[PDB]
Design a protein around this nucleic acid. Structure first.
Lengths: 116, 101, 180
DNA sequence: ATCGATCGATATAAAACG
DNA sequence: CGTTTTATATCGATCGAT
């Protein structure tokens, strides 16, 4: 669905595999196991269907309180949070979000919610 | 001396945890190696989102709950409009960390 | 005068009588923010009545934003009830209003510098610093912020009656310096 | 470079307290 | 000293925006 998210995800898995290859070797685990990790990782991602991947063709109250493929969740960084009365404004950055089984990634996010 | 771990709760991070657990249960790797992969993941996600992200979305809605503890902001936005690049969303949980140390 | 100042904010203190783990409160209460690095207290807000409480480790708190004595006591009771519901031996004790703020609109403009020169011992006016004139009334002991617009701010009262008496006392002088 | 704009002071009272 | 609330209002800002 989202090109950017697709790209970001693919770059992450290839990049993580390269960063840990050194730790696998250091642990006595061979290259095939590292590859296996990439494969299972890829398959799982395709199974979620939050976006399409280039490898897809290969896989044809007043007190605090949920988390799953159906929870709409945004994970990211924050530049500044401010509120005036009940009006909140949130400047976010470098984040990823799942909205209705679909994923998006962002450079910046602007939030404007009224606590009422 | 590390990066935030919130991203492990994301779709890609959760899938990595899954893949990592199957190899652990198969006895193909040690849990320690799995944890080390997760910690590298934290770094890589932070860098990939910082250097290969261009989109800029915005959220408008009613803040149902907010919270700030341990330098972390949590927001539950209900009945909001998420515009990417427009999406209607009944509920949206936002968990964010400080961009600064 | 024919006008009655409107109560805009009431600050009250409440001793819950029992030590608190602010870190725990912040974790179990919704709409709570805790940043000890800047303020050693948990800031919590509720919608009914729309107020904000400052909760301390000592078990004492400050409730702000209430617009009536009843809403203040009522809101205070809700905060205490949350602390309890979280798991503390909190109790609603020593409720006491510490400050009441009210505002008015006399509807006409005011020549402030004339009022300041006339009542020099009570008013401090220097638009450079702040656009409004600061009138420090003696009886009752209420501080007023008088603006060119006719808008009046009265604060420092512990009884809502003091705001009313403060406004009645100042109306004649406000009228005397009306721009007309 | 320039707008209406929102943004951070500036001023007021008062309590809590590390 | 810092934090919170709230009415009130003016003077720089940065501020996307001409």
């Amino acid at each position: 669905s989202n090109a950017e998210a697709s790209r970001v995800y693919e770059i992450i898995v290839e990049s993580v595999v390269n960063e840990v290859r050194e730790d696998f070797e250091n642990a006595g685990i061979d290259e095939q196991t590292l590859q296996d990790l990439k494969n299972i990782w890829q398959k799982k991602l395709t199974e979620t269907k939050v976006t399409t991947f280039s490898w897809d063709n290969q896989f044809n109250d007043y007190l605090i309180s949920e988390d799953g493929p159906d929870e709409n969740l945004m994970l990211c960084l924050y530049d500044k949070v401010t509120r005036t009365k009940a009006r909140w404004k949130c400047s976010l950055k470098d984040g990823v979000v799942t909205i209705n089984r679909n994923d998006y990634t962002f450079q910046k996010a602007q939030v404007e919610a009224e606590w009422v | 001396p590390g990066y935030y771990e919130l991203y492990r709760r994301s779709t890609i991070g959760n899938s990595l945890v899954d893949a990592l657990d199957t190899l652990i249960s198969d006895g193909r790797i040690e849990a320690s190696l799995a944890m080390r992969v997760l910690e590298t993941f934290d770094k890589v996600v932070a860098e990939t989102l910082k250097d290969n992200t261009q989109s800029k979305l915005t959220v408008k809605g009613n803040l149902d709950t907010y919270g700030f503890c341990d330098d972390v902001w949590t927001f539950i936005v209900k009945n909001c409009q998420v515009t990417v690049e427009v999406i209607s969303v009944d509920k949206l949980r936002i968990v964010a960390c400080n961009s600064k140390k | 005068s024919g006008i009655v100042p409107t109560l805009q904010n009431i600050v009250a203190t409440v001793t819950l009588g029992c030590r608190l783990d602010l870190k725990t409160v912040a974790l179990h209460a919704r709409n709570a923010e805790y940043n000890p690095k800047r303020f050693a207290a948990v800031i919590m807000r509720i919608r009914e009545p729309k107020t904000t409480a400052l909760i301390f480790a000592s078990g004492k708190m400050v409730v702000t934003g209430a617009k009536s004595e009843d809403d203040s006591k009522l809101a205070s009771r809700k905060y205490a009830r949350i602390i309890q519901k979280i798991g503390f031996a909190a109790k609603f004790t020593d409720f006491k209003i510490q400050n009441i703020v009210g505002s008015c609109d006399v509807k006409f403009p005011i020549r402030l510098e004339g009022l300041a020169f006339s009542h020099g011992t009570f008013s401090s006016y220097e638009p450079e610093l702040f656009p409004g004139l600061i009138y420090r009334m003696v009886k009752p002991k209420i501080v007023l912020l008088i603006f060119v617009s006719g808008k009046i701010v009265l604060t420092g009262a512990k009884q809502r009656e003091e705001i009313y008496q403060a406004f009645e006392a100042i109306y004649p002088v406000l009228s005397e310096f009306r721009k007309m």
